[PDB]
Amino acid sequence: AGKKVLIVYAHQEPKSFNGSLKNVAVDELSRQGCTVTVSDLYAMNFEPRATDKDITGTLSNPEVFNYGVETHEAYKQRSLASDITDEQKKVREADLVIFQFPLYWFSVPAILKGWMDRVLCQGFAFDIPGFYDSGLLQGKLALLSVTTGGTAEMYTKTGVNGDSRYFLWPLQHGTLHFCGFKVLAPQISFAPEIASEEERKGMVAAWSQRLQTIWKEEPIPCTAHWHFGQ
Amino acid sequence: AGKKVLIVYAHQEPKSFNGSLKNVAVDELSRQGCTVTVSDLYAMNFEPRATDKDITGTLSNPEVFNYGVETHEAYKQRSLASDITDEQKKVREADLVIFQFPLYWFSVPAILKGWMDRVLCQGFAFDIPGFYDSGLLQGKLALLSVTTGGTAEMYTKTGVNGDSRYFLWPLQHGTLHFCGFKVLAPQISFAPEIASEEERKGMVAAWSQRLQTIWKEEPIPCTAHWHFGQ
Ligand SMILES: Cc1cc2nc3c(=O)[nH]c(=O)nc-3n(C[C@H](O)[C@H](O)[C@H](O)COP(=O)(O)OP(=O)(O)OC[C@H]3O[C@@H](n4cnc5c(N)ncnc54)[C@H](O)[C@@H]3O)c2cc1C
Ligand SMILES: Cc1cc2nc3c(=O)[nH]c(=O)nc-3n(C[C@H](O)[C@H](O)[C@H](O)COP(=O)(O)OP(=O)(O)OC[C@H]3O[C@@H](n4cnc5c(N)ncnc54)[C@H](O)[C@@H]3O)c2cc1C
Numbered sequence: 001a002g003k004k005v006l007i008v009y010a011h012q013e014p015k016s017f018n019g020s021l022k023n024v025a026v027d028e029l030s031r032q033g034c035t036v037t038v039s040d041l042y043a044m045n046f047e048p049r050a051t052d053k054d055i056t057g058t059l060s061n062p063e064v065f066n067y068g069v070e071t072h073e074a075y076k077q078r079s080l081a082s083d084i085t086d087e088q089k090k091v092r093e094a095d096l097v098i099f100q101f102p103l104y105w106f107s108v109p110a111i112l113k114g115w116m117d118r119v120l121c122q123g124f125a126f127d128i129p130g131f132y133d134s135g136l137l138q139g140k141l142a143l144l145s146v147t148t149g150g151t152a153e154m155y156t157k158t159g160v161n162g163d164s165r166y167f168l169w170p171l172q173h174g175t176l177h178f179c180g181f182k183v184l185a186p187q188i189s190f191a192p193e194i195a196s197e198e199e200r201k202g203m204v205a206a207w208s209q210r211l212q213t214i215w216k217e218e219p220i221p222c223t224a225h226w227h228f229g230q
Numbered sequence: 231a232g233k234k235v236l237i238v239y240a241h242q243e244p245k246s247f248n249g250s251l252k253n254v255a256v257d258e259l260s261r262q263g264c265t266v267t268v269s270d271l272y273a274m275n276f277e278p279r280a281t282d283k284d285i286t287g288t289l290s291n292p293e294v295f296n297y298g299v300e301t302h303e304a305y306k307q308r309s310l311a312s313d314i315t316d317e318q319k320k321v322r323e324a325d326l327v328i329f330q331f332p333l334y335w336f337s338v339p340a341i342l343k344g345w346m347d348r349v350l351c352q353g354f355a356f357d358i359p360g361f362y363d364s365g366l367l368q369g370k371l372a373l374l375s376v377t378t379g380g381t382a383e384m385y386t387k388t389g390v391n392g393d394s395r396y397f398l399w400p401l402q403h404g405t406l407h408f409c410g411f412k413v414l415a416p417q418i419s420f421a422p423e424i425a426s427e428e429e430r431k432g433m434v435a436a437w438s439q440r441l442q443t444i445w446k447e448e449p450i451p452c453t454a455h456w457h458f459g460q
C-alpha cells in the first residue's frame with residue numbers, strides 16, 4: 001500500500017549525488033503512494049555525541065556516568081532528550097528505513113554514526129535478551145544506500161580495499177540485524193565523481209528503477225558467510 | 231623513551247574502565263620517559279560533524295559544497311578550523327597514536343568517528359600518490375584499545391557477533407593502514423562490566439605489562455588474510 005518509509009540522510013549539499021539519490025527515493029516512493037519521511041541530519045544539526053545531556057531525569061548513578069545504563073533507564077522513564085525520541089517515533093512508525101550516505105572511512109559519516117549510537121538505545125531498538133532475530137525492530141526492513149570515492153574494482157576480493165561486503169558487516173549485521181531488521185541488499189553507487197555524465201544518470205535511474213519493485217524483495221541472509229564467503 | 235605518544239580518548243566518565251586504561255597508559259609511558267599527550271574528546275566537546283565550518287575565510291566553491299575538496303584546499307592553504315589543526319599538530323608529532331574507546335555498534339563512538347573524519351583529511355593523512363603503504367603518516371604506529379560489552383565467546387567465527395577481526399577491518403585497514411600507519415595488535419578488553427574485579431585487574435595489568443615492551447613490537451600484517459582467512 002500502504003508502506004511507511006524513513007530516509008535517514010547524511011550529506012551537507014542538496015545538489016550532491018547523495019541529494020539526488022535521496023530525492024529520487026522520495027519521488028519514486030511518493031509516486032507509489034507510500035508515506036515518506038526524511039531525517040536530513042546535517043540540516044537538523046543533529047547531535048552525534050553520546051553525553052549526559054541525552055538524559056533529563058534523575059540519574060541512576062550520578063557519581064559515575066554510564067551512558068548505556070542511563071539511556072536504558074531514561075528510555076523506560078521517558079526522560080530521554082526530545083531529539084532522540086523524535087527519531088524513535090520516525091523509526092517506530094516506519095516499515096522501511098533507508099540510510100542514504102557517502103562512505104566515510106569504510107563506514108558512515110560521524111553525524112549518522114551518532115544517530116545510530118543515540119537513537120538505537122537499549123529498550124527501544126534491542127534488549128538483553130532481545131537482539132539479532134529477537135531484536136526489537138523485528139518486522140522492519142532496512143537498506144543502506146552508499147556512495148563511494150573508490151571504484152567497483154578497488155572494492156573487490158583482490159582490490160586494495162577488499163570486498164565491499166567486508167565494510168558492510170558492522171552496519172548490516174552488527175547494527176541493523178542486531179536490532180531485528182531484515183536487511184535488503186545494499187545499493188552501492190561506485191565512484192560517481194569519476195563516472196561520466198551518462199554512467200551517473202544510469203546509476204540514479206538504476207536506484208529509481210530498483211525502488212519500483214522494492215516491496216517484492218527478499219532480505220539478504222545477514223550472516224558471516226554472505227559477508228565473507230568460505 | 232624519546233618517543234611521542236598521542237592517546238585519543240573517547241569516554242564520558244573518568245572513573246570508567248576506559249578511564250583506567252587511559253590512565254595506566256599515561257602513567258606507564260610517562261614512567262618510561264616518553265612524551266605523552268591526550269585528546270580527551272568528550273571533555274573537549276569535540277565537534278564530530280563534517281561541515282563548512284571546518285574551512286575558515288571564503289570557500290573555493292560556495293555554490294556546491296564538497297567537503298572532501300574544500301578540506302583538501304583548506305589544508306594546503308592553512309585554512310582549516312583550529313580544532314582540526316590542533317589535532318593534526320599532535321598527530322604529526324606522535325610516533326604512536328593509541329585510540330582508547332568502548333566499542334559502539336562494532337565501531338568507534340561517533341565522537342571519535344568525527345575525529346577521524348575531520349582530522350584525517352586529504353593532504354594530511356593521505357593523498358594521490360599516498361595511501362596504504364605510502365599513506366602520509368608512514369613511519370608512525372597506531373593501536374586500537376577497545377573495550378566491549380560482549381564476551382570473548384560472542385566474538386568468535388561461529389559466535390553471534392562473528393570474529394573481532396571482522397569489525398576491526400574498517401578501522402585498522404580502511405582507516406589506519408590507509409593513512410600509512412603500521413598497526414599494532416589491537417588491545418581488546420572483553421566485557422569488563424560482567425567480569426569480576428580481579429580479571430578486571432588482570433586486564434588492566436595486561437595493558438600495563440604490554441606497554442612496557444610496546445617499542446619492541448612487530449606490527450601486524452594489515453591484510454585481508456589477517457582479518458578474514460585462516
Ligand atoms: C571524510 C571523508 C571520508 C571518505 N572516506 C571514503 C572511504 O573510506 N572510501 C571511499 O571509497 N570513499 C571515501 N570518501 C569519498 C566519498 O565517499 C565520496 O566523495 C562520496 O561518496 C561521493 O558522493 P557525493 O554525493 O558527495 O558525490 P558528488 O561529488 O556530490 O557527485 C559527483 C558528481 O555527480 C553529480 N551529480 C549530482 N546529482 C546528479 C544527478 N542527478 N545526475 C548526474 N550527476 C549528478 C554532481 O554534480 C557531481 O558533479 C570519503 C570522503 C570524505 C570527505
Ligand atoms: C551506544 C552503545 C553501543 C554499544 N555497542 C556495542 C557493540 O557494538 N558491541 C559490544 O560488545 N558492546 C557494545 N556496547 C557496550 C559497550 O562497549 C561497553 O559497555 C563498554 O565497552 C564498557 O566499557 P566501559 O569503560 O564504559 O565500562 P565501565 O562500566 O566503566 O567499567 C566496567 C567496570 O569496571 C570498573 N572499573 C573502572 N576502573 C577499574 C579498575 N582500575 N580496575 C577494576 N575495575 C575498574 C568500573 O567501575 C565498572 O564497574 C555499546 C554500548 C553503547 C552505549
Ligand SMILES: CC(=O)Nc1ccc2c(c1)[C@@H](CC#N)C(=O)N2C
Nearest residue numbers: 105106149150161298352404405408
Ligand atoms: C576526500 C576523500 O575522498 N577521502 C577519502 C578518505 C578515505 C578513503 C577514500 C577517500 C577512498 C578511495 C577514494 N577516492 C578510500 O578507499 N578510503 C579509505
Ligand SMILES: CC(=O)Nc1ccc2c(c1)[C@@H](CC#N)C(=O)N2C
Nearest residue numbers: 068122174175178335336379380391
Ligand atoms: C548499552 C549496550 O550494551 N549497548 C549495546 C549496543 C549494541 C550492541 C551491544 C551492546 C553488544 C552486546 C553487548 N553487550 C552488541 O553486540 N551490539 C551490536
Ligand SMILES: [Zn+2]
Nearest residue numbers: 173177222223
Ligand atoms: Zn546479520
Ligand SMILES: [Zn+2]
Nearest residue numbers: 403407452453
Ligand atoms: Zn591493512
